[PDB]
């Protein structure tokens, strides 16, 4: 049984850690993306056709 | 109280003494599981290119 558990436990690890990985990536993307939007609200052109 | 406690202590110190021993085992072995698991986890592979 504790033959299974110390990989059981091993995985549980590891998905917490890509998991969290994934939440520090679009946590990030928000906060950069807040910092995007304030960056450009002031009035201001839009390059386009 | 006593003797009940001391019997499960008993136990617990045996078998924790019996969990010191199965820890010698190496890690190299605990290492080799998990190269089992990467061995005995998937089996096909799909889509041969």
Do not use: A, P
Request: charged share 50%; hydrophobic share 30%; glycine share 4%.
């Amino acid at each position: 049984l504790k033959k299974e558990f110390e990989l059981s436990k091993l995985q549980q690890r590891l998905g917490r850690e890509v998991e969290e990985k994934i939440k520090q990536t679009h946590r990030k993307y928000l906060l950069q993306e807040q910092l995007k939007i304030i960056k450009k609200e002031l009035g201001l052109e839009k390059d386009d056709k």
